[PDB]
Write a protein that binds this DNA or RNA. Structure first.
Length: 677
RNA sequence: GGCAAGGGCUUCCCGAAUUGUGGAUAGUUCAAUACUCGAAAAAAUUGGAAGUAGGGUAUGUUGCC
């Protein structure tokens, strides 16, 4: 009853022996001391009454249903509670003495703060720990030979791995349901108390199932259909419902499979995704590409936040060249509520069939995936030979129209999600509305449907009928035009139900309006702060540095930072408008200062074991500073301020790097940088 | 590198019953393991399409002439 260490001593020991690559003999006596330590820890485990320990330390509260995300317990308090659990579980011997106990406790806080697929290399996490203080690593307390030292070194690393990978993780799951937030700017995790989560889950899913789901009988499990697992993701104040496809079939689920059937089901899972599902996604993405090339109405739909900024920058330059100045623009920002949930399944089906109505019933499309071209709408090496490309090979897949349409409707209708109740009995639900979020084809389905919707419902726009800007990223819409007659027509059909034929319901409350009367200083459409009456954009504070994950060397750090700076310094940020450098130099300064000090922060941690090469870093500074100037002159096509922009770069570099003895070389070099002669 | 210890691995047995400071026999080898930088010819540009010599870092490296 509520015990952290479920596995037995033998199973635990075999888990670390396999990890460390150790294969002891049947007569080995080295691990006698460890078997004793485990028994003491398990004795402390059973003696602990964690239920009252949680109430004492954390405290029990009533389930909040108004703000469903308030139930989460702060990570700071979570870290302290597990540190209390570890102190009762692990004797001093398990910590490796006083000095190691301080280091190990410090590393636990580091591990718990990572979140969202962040990892710390075990060479970093387990560094500075005195191996000598771990007496139980061998039957003798003293190290005598090198074979003994190597063997104890492997065992200690395996033991430390079990503490963090098995023990620490199983403590978190016992008390908290750990899940990722729906946000993309912040990759922090939410720790909802386990008893509170079951109340939130049962409440939300039961209400959701009333409008979106249809309960299935137990004998639906015997059918082979797409099967996922219903989970909840809190965005900031409510829950998003997604479905994660399970790596097995409906019949074999819940749960028994152990005798290598779990692996062959997983080999069939990855096969179905790579042989039919992903090939279908390519074809469906390709069919939408042709409609983008053909119709200007399909070209209004973009597939990235970067395209939105460029579309606005193109419209700004259109008014600029045509009129010399930006007139009073009528802006219309609206979005669709529950876009994926409300989708009209039958209308989606017919729009997918219209992609193949031009061709015959058996067209036999050929697909052969290569990461160099999946979504485009540098040295690829194919033609294997006896000199250049010398069981899971790359092969061309042939899918006919009939099969493509059959698997499409299967991913729309036949998908079934499972819900395990309190007792354990699973409840299988089919969907009464649009596709489940989390399935590979659900994204492209909404793209084709909504891009078809904008085509025919807004056909008045594409009749010339010119001088307007309509853009739909995924579900948020934006319209900018000086024509008032265009403003009224789009607003008129938003007050109607013409869009309700599709799974599109306008979010009436979140519709932002800027017109001749309602004059607002600026509008945030998607992660961008578009300034009204000049169409100058500046990115909202919605992007953080990934650096922590997997980067532990100067080479890999500057490699990402270089590719990160050049990827975030896109065209729409360098626009000058012939008078304004401030909107550029301090827009660039934000990205520049944040990437430079991010390098300084990781510097002190990784310089302890790595070797810093100043000349290589100066080349990195030169590459990004050159890229900034060439991209500034490219976008504006004229440079009234290019020397001023470089002067800003140098001042930033000379400021951030005037503290350390090794940064001195940077300061002297950067001041010599200049474009003009 | 010589001498003196002691040890690791491998094998057998005695205890325990998810609670080992127990005994014995032969073989083997006892200072490095991991990580990160990284040269020198005829010049670059580059290190994952996975790098020597030689460095740095963490954990370590018996007493005695």
């Amino acid at each position: 009853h509520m015990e952290m260490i479920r596995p037995s001593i033998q199973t635990i020991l075999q888990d670390i022996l396999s990890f460390s690559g150790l294969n002891p003999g049947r007569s080995s006596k080295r691990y006698r001391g460890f078997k004793s330590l485990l028994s003491r820890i398990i004795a402390n485990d059973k003696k602990c009454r964690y239920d009252i320990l949680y109430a004492k330390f954390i405290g029990t509260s009533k389930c909040n249903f108004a703000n469903v995300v308030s139930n989460k317990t702060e990570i700071s308090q979570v870290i302290q509670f597990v540190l209390l659990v570890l102190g009762k579980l692990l004797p001093l011997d398990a910590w490796g003495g006083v000095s190691n106990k301080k280091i190990i406790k410090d590393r636990v806080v580091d591990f718990l703060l990572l979140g969202a697929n962040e990892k710390i290399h075990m060479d970093d996490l387990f560094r500075g720990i005195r191996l000598k203080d771990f007496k139980w690593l061998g039957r003798a307390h003293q190290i005598s030979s090198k074979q003994d030292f190597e063997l104890r070194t492997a065992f200690l690393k395996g033991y430390l791995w079990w503490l963090f990978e098995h023990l620490l993780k199983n403590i978190l799951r016992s008390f908290w349901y750990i899940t990722e937030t729906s946000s993309i700017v912040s990759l922090e995790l939410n720790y909802f108390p386990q008893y509170l989560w079951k109340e939130l889950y049962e409440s939300w899913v039961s209400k959701y199932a009333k409008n979106n789901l249809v309960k299935m009988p137990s004998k639906i499990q015997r059918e082979q259909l797409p099967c996922g697992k219903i989970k909840l993701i809190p965005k900031r104040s409510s829950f998003r419902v997604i479905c994660v496809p399970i790596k097995r079939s409906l019949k074999l689920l819940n749960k028994k499979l152990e005798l290598d059937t779990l692996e062959k089901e997983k080999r069939e899972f990855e096969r179905y995704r790579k042989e039919v599902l992903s090939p279908v996604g390519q074809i469906l993405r390709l069919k939408l590409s042709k409609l983008r090339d053909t119709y200007e109405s399909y070209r209004a739909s973009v597939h990235s936040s970067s395209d939105v900024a460029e579309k606005i920058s193109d419209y700004r330059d259109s008014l600029l060249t045509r009129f010399g100045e930006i007139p009073k623009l009528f802006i219309l920002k609206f979005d669709m509520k529950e876009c994926y949930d409300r989708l009209s399944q039958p209308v989606l089906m017919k729009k997918l069939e219209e992609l193949f109505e031009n061709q015959d019933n058996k067209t036999s499309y050929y697909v052969r995936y290569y990461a160099q071209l999946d979504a485009s709408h540098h040295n690829l090496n194919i033609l294997s030979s006896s000199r250049h490309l010398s069981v899971d090979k790359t092969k061309t897949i042939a899918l006919q129209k009939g099969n493509i349409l059959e698997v499409c409707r299967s991913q729309i209708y036949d998908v079934v999600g499972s819900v395990k109740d309190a007792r354990g009995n699973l409840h299988l639900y089919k969907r009464k509305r649009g596709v489940f979020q989390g399935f590979s084809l659900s994204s492209i389905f909404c793209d084709i449907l909504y891009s078809a919707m904008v085509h025919d419902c807004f056909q008045f726009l594409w009749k010339s009928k010119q001088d307007f800007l309509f853009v739909r990223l995924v579900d948020d819409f934006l319209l900018v035009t000086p024509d008032s007659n265009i403003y009224d027509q789009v607003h008129n059909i938003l007050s109607g139900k013409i869009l309700e034929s599709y799974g599109a319901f306008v979010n009436k409350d979140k519709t932002v309006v800027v017109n001749q009367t309602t004059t607002k200083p600026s509008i945030d459409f998607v992660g961008l702060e578009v300034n009204t009456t000049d169409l100058s954009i500046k990115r909202n504070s919605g992007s953080i540095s990934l650096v922590t994950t997997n980067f532990r060397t100067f080479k890999t750090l500057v490699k990402y930072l270089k590719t990160f700076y050049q990827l975030n310094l896109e065209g729409f940020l360098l626009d000058c408008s012939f008078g304004v450098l401030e909107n550029v130099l301090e827009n660039m300064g934000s990205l520049l200062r944040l990437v430079l000090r991010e390098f300084k922060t990781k510097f002190t941690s990784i310089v302890k074991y790595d070797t810093f090469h100043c000349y290589k870093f100066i080349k990195f500074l030169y590459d990004i500073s050159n890229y900034t100037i060439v991209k500034y002159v490219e976008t504006n096509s004229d440079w009234d301020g290019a020397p001023e922009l470089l002067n800003c770069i140098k001042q930033i570099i000379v400021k951030e790097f005037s503290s350390f003895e090794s940064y001195s070389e940077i300061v002297e070099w950067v001041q010599t940088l200049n474009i003009v002669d």
